[PDB]
Structures are given as structure tokens and as C-alpha cells.
């Protein structure tokens, strides 16, 4: 009530919250096409912005799933009623979002499509979407039972340096 926790401990706990939510949203909106959560706290309110491809799927029928997720978030993290809201915005250039495209690769693999052909199509899609280059690694048991590994790669990459932090999207 009159706590005002440490600047140190506050920022850590805020990040933790963001981290836990990112995961919960990753796990729940897996097939729906989750691409991120961009939270911002405000006066007597907490706007959190969900990023995804299929926005009609995340919102649900008429206004359902978003109301459930807000209620579960509300219930979970200890948020008073009407202090929080889930704002599902659409992802511009899905083919640059890696985590979207890793889920899309997960999906196709679960769909029983060939390890090569799905991954090759995933690669061609992201590269047509206008990226400097890309690097796809489906690993683990790709036929047989000795853990082989594919590595479908095209175009311009960077590994070493600071640049890689901001200049490559990893997933």
C-alpha cells in the first residue's frame, strides 16, 4: 500500500513481469501467430500491446479471447479491475519477424511437411519480405535416429560485433 520498493528492485521486477508475460503469451498464442508484447504503464492504467499476424484469431469471436487474457493477466499479477488492457496490433512485414517465422516453421513441421521443403519455403518467404540475409537451422533427428542437422542459409549475415544485437532478428 505504502511500500515504494527500491529503484533497483523495481526495475528488475518490471522486467521479470515483462519476461513472464512474454512467455505466457508465447505459449498461449503459439499457433495464433504471436510476435511480441510492448507494455507501457500510464496514469491509473496499463496498456499492453500484443503483436501478431492473425489479429482476428487473438481477439476472438466478437470480442472474447482478449477479454479472457486480460482477465487472466488481471487475476495473475495482482492488478485491480480496469487498470489493464490488451491491445492486439497487427505485425508489419511478418517475414522480418523471426519468432513469427520460427513458429511458422514449427507449424509446417508439425503439419508433416518435409524437413527440407517447409524450411526452404520459410527461407524464401522471409527473403522475399526484404531482409539483408537469413540463417535457418532445423536440427535434431531429421530421419534415422542419429541427430543430424540442416542449415538452410542465404544472403548477408553478421555474427560478431555489437551490430548483431540490433541488426539481426533471432528466434
Amino acid at each position: 500500500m505504502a511500500v515504494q520498493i527500491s529503484k533497483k528492485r523495481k526495475f528488475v521486477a518490471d522486467g521479470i513481469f515483462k519476461a513472464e508475460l512474454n512467455e505466457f503469451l508465447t505459449r498461449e498464442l503459439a499457433e495464433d501467430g504471436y510476435s511480441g508484447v510492448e507494455v507501457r504503464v500510464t496514469p491509473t492504467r496499463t496498456e499492453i500491446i500484443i503483436l501478431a499476424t492473425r489479429t482476428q484469431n487473438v481477439l476472438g469471436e466478437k470480442g472474447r479471447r482478449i477479454r479472457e487474457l486480460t482477465a487472466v493477466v488481471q487475476k495473475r499479477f495482482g492488478f485491480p479491475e480496469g487498470s489493464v488492457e490488451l491491445y492486439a496490433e497487427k505485425v508489419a512485414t511478418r517475414g522480418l519477424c523471426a519468432i513469427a517465422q520460427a513458429e511458422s516453421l514449427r507449424y509446417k513441421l508439425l503439419g508433416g511437411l518435409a524437413v527440407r521443403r517447409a524450411c526452404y519455403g520459410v527461407l524464401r518467404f522471409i527473403m522475399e519480405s526484404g531482409a539483408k540475409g537469413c540463417e535457418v537451422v532445423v536440427s535434431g533427428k531429421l530421419r534415422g535416429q542419429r541427430a543430424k542437422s540442416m542449415k538452410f542459409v542465404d544472403g548477408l549475415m553478421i555474427h560478431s560485433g555489437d551490430p548483431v544485437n540490433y541488426y539481426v532478428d533471432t528466434a
Partner: protein
């Protein structure tokens, strides 16, 4: 239809009142977060929700030792049948959008 009556039926009404429901995966919580009418702890809640899910009347997501139970449409009708409720009812997803 199980166990202490007052407890179970208080869980089912909480799950109806709010369209979703959460716990924490912690077998030892003589209180439960929210609810808290009388003991009505974690477990009972946790084991009722697992009972719904098995017969098809609630869905699941785990994420960091916690649980998040989204309730089905076919679950709604089961709960209303269990609680002999009126057909109007309004569970939770009414909410004015714009």
C-alpha cells in the same frame, strides 16, 4: 459432483463469475489467491479444474508454475447444468468494446 460441497461449488461459481480462472502450482496454500471465503485452498481448486479439463469443460496453459484456465462454451453449459442456473446468466464475456 465430488468432495466437500461448499468448497467445490464455490470454485465453480468463481470460474463462472470470471470467464477464466488461475491458481499457482503449489499444493500448500491454505487460502488460495482471491476467493478466500474459508480455507478453500490451492488444491480443491487445482484438482477441480483438472476434473473439468479431462471431461472437456475447461482448457489449459501452464507458463511459469501458475496455470491459466480458459473456460469452453461446452464447459459453460455444464457449469449452468451443475448450478441449475437461468438461461440468461451472463458469465463474463459481455464487455462493451467501442
Amino acid at each position: 459432483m465430488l468432495m466437500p460441497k461448499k468448497n467445490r461449488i464455490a470454485i465453480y461459481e468463481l470460474l463462472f463469475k470470471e470467464g477464466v480462472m488461475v491458481a499457482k502450482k503449489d499444493v500448500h496454500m491454505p487460502k488460495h489467491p482471491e476467493l478466500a471465503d474459508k480455507n478453500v485452498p490451492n488444491l480443491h481448486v487445482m484438482k477441480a479444474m483438472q476434473s473439468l479439463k479431462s471431461r472437456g469443460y475447461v482448457k489449459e496453459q501452464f507458463a511459469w508454475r501458475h496455470f491459466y484456465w480458459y473456460l469452453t462454451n461446452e464447459g459453460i453449459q455444464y457449469l449452468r447444468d451443475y448450478l441449475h442456473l437461468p438461461p440468461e446468466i451472463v458469465p463474463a464475456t459481455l464487455r462493451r468494446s467501442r
